[PDB]
Amino acid sequence: LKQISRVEAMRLGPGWSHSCHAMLYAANPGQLFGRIPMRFSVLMQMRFDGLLGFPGGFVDRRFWSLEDGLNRVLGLGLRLTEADYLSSHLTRVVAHLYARQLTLEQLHAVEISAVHSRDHGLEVLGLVRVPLYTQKDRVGGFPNFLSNAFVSTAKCQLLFALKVLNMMPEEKLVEALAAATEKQKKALEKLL
Amino acid sequence: LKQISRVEAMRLGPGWSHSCHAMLYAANPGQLFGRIPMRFSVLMQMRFDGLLGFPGGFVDRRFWSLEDGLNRVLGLGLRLTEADYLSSHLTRVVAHLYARQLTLEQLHAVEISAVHSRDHGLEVLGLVRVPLYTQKDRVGGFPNFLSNAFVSTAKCQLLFALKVLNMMPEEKLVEALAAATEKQKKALEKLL
Ligand SMILES: [Cl-]
Ligand SMILES: [Cl-]
């Protein structure tokens, strides 16, 4: 999945569309069932098209910079800047990823704001927290989560961000994705 | 997937576990992008194990009837009865399904209550609305939704309930599931 610099992406022809998305996350000192460390909580959402993705959407560059556009397309009813920028990937779409660490209290505030948003029940069908832990059965939690259906680029963006923000070791991300994919294969083999 | 009567399920040995779940839904006169009829909204949720399911959980029959247990395990921070019962299926677990039509306003109230619940961010990671429409590309909406990962029995329960409550024609449910499964197959073929 080709990476491109923000400033080079901005020079692409008018035939290129730009999407901007935000990964909002918080340290989570919670312990599921009092024994499984949650470590972090990340917000994703169910989109109108039945896929999981990050808050955000397409930015009309006739009106807005990437950052000004981002803040207007989050749909969370709620100021991200270049300081929050992570990377851009070619998917004729360039997908721009931003990330911001909040307190867990602030992350909950976003969830509350979201349910009261104007976009709730239209383009956004509900927020979900990503489980980053893996249960003893080696599938419950993050591997199962990664076996859901994601909008183009979002799954790759999630895994990229977890790595580069030092939220999970690369080895554990590789394992979780392998477990997810094996699960999908086995499930499809039962059906076919 | 074997069906069993409620009263026969109640006679099963102590080696059988019982789960009770609720499908809360409302008529939705909304039109996505002003052209796609939404028809109904149904609530599901992201569980702690990274799978989509209905609100509910295991009922300890040493303490509660199926109905008394159901109302205590919803996790929505909020009275379902035998009148709301739909069916029971053998999955060593019997999965009991209940359903209740609310106003859209009441359905939104449940979403608000849920984000403020004691279980939010523990066993429940967020509610989502099911998109029952299909976009012009024949995958956006319900087929994509059905391509997510579901906890045992939930996907079958959803499709069963949509049929028997006359919310979607059987032909359209069959089509949506076929589209979902073909999508999963094609996606897995790209990876392998
Ligand atoms: Cl576990
Ligand atoms: Cl469409």
CA distance A5 to B77: 46
Please give the structure tokens belonging to residue B187.
Answer: 């996606």
Q: What is the dihedral of CA B149, B187, A172, A91, to 10 degrees?
A: -120
A187 close to A180: Cβ distance less than 8 angstroms:
no
Taking alpha carbons only, the member of B190, B166, B174, B105 closest to residue B142 is B174
Taking alpha carbons only, the member of A143, A129, A132, A153 closest to residue A186 is A143
CA distance A162 to A180: 16
Contacts of B108 (CB under 8 A, 6+ apart): A115, A121
> Distance, CA A171 to ligand 1 centroid (Å)?
20
**B49 to chain A, minimum CA–CA distance in Å?**
4
> What value, to the nearest 5°, has the Cα angle with vertex A155 and ends A175 and A182?
40
Final resolution, Å:
1.7
Taking alpha carbons only, the member of A190, A174, A169, A179 closest to residue A144 is A179
Of all residues in chain A, the one with the smallest CA distance to B34 is A122
Q: What is the DSSP letter of B84?
A: G
Of all residues in chain B, the one with the smallest CA distance to A185 is B188
B148 close to A52: Cβ distance less than 8 angstroms:
yes
Q: How many residues does this entry show for chain B?
A: 192
CATH number at residue A174: 3.90.79.10
**Beta-carbon separation of A111 and B116 below 8 A:** no
Q: Who among A51, A135, A184 is closest to B184 (CB)?
A: A184
CA distance A2 to A24: 24
> Distance, CA B43 to ligand 2 centroid (Å)?
22
**Beta-carbon separation of A125 and B131 below 8 A:** yes
Contacts of A77 (CB under 8 A, 6+ apart): A113, A114, A116, A117, A118, A119, A120
B147 close to B59: Cβ distance less than 8 angstroms:
no
CB pairs under 8 A between A and B: 118
Contacts of B1 (CB under 8 A, 6+ apart): B89, B90, B91, B153, B156
Chain A residues with beta carbon closer than 8 angstroms to that of B147 = 50, 149
**A93 to chain B, minimum CA–CA distance in Å?**
18
For A2-15, give the DSSP string: -EE-HHHHTTS-TT
Q: Who among B32, B125, B187 is closest to A122 (CB)?
A: B32
> Distance, CA A79 to ligand 1 centroid (Å)?
38
φ, ψ of residue A39 to 5 degrees: the values are 70, -65
Chain B residues with beta carbon closer than 8 angstroms to that of A183 = 149
Taking alpha carbons only, the member of A142, A70, A121, A129 closest to residue A102 is A129
**In a mutagenesis test of the B interface, which of A110, A128, A147 is the best target, namely the one with the most B β-carbons within 10 Å?**
A128
**Beta-carbon separation of B116 and A112 below 8 A:** yes
**Total tally of structural domains belonging to chain B:** 1
Please give the structure tokens belonging to residue B101.
Answer: 């039509």
> Distance, CA B41 to ligand 2 centroid (Å)?
18
Q: Kind of pairing, strands A17-32 and A3-4?
A: unpaired
Helix or strand holding residue B25 (H, E): strand B17-32
B107 close to B23: Cβ distance less than 8 angstroms:
no
Name the residue range of residue A113's domain.
1-192
CA distance A162 to B65: 44
